């Protein structure tokens, strides 16, 4: 019947438009995560480098005793 | 043939709902995942901010 068919058609038109937004959101998400993953990698590296220098400074100091 | 196109159209509707449902479940998983990591980053930010204060006072 045509009230059913028309509604099914508006629903699908509406789903489609929203799938288009979801694609755009998923892509931005992906990019932001790639950028934060690189940033996390620089943080890990810098934290480990920081901890080595902390331990070293302390070990040099412990010779002062 | 009228019934025939409704029957195959119906199958494809169901196939489309399955994918949409899978897509919805990923979008929920992602948000749970990111929210969880929101909380791990709160603690890291806290631990770091205090290590900053420590090192600064000690020098």
């Amino acid at each position: 019947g045509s009230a059913r068919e028309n509604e099914m058609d508006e629903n699908l038109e509406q789903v489609s438009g929203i799938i288009g937004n979801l694609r755009h959101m998923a892509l931005d998400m992906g990019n932001e995560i790639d950028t934060q993953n690189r940033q996390i990698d620089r943080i890990m590296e810098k934290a480990d480098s920081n901890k080595t220098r902390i331990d070293e400074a302390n070990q040099r100091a412990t010779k002062m005793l | 043939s009228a019934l025939s196109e409704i029957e195959t159209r119906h199958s494809e509707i169901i196939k489309l709902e399955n994918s949409i449902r899978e897509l919805h479940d990923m979008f929920m998983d992602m948000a749970m995942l990111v929210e969880s990591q929101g909380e791990m980053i709160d603690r890291i930010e806290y631990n770091v901010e205090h290590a900053v204060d420590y090192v600064e006072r000690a020098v």
């Binding site: 699908l12 789903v15 489609s16 799938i19 288009g20 979801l22 694609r23 998923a26 892509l27 998400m29 992906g30 995560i33 790639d34 934060q36 993953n37 996390i40 990698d41 890990m44 | 159209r9 494809e12 509707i13 196939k15 489309l16 994918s19 949409i20 899978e22 897509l23 990923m26 979008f27 998983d29 992602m30 995942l33 990111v34 969880s36 990591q37 791990m40 980053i41 890291i44």
Partner: peptide
């Protein structure tokens, strides 16, 4: 027009699966 939707959705699915893989990776770095 139905067909353009099935393929459109399965593309986002593929994209969200990669994204979820990156975030399991980001979970491992934290």
């Amino acid at each position: 027009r139905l067909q353009q939707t099935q393929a459109q959705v399965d593309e986002v699915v593929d994209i969200m699966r990669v994204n979820v893989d990156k975030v399991l990776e980001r979970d491992q770095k934290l």
